[PDB]
Symmetry: C3
Subunit: 28 residues, 3 copies
Amino acid sequence: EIXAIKKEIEAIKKEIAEIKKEIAXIKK
Amino acid sequence: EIXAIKKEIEAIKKEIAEIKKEIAXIKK
Amino acid sequence: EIXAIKKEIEAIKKEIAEIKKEIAXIKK
Ligand SMILES: [Cu+2]
């Protein structure tokens, strides 16, 4: 279960990283 | 403990969904 | 392992709160 939790956490970090890229794009 | 962690991940997923909708609202 | 998972979740929460504040600051 811990492995599956580490899997969901890794996808959340990747999705947040993409959200930060769009915010940086909107700023420009 | 692990249940507590599960409730945090589900709450995090819902905020990320709301953040995407808020970004879409600002673009419009 | 659990100590590291809580540390990542606590950091993700802090990142989401920063994103919500910064998104409100943006003017299209
Ligand atoms: Cu919001």
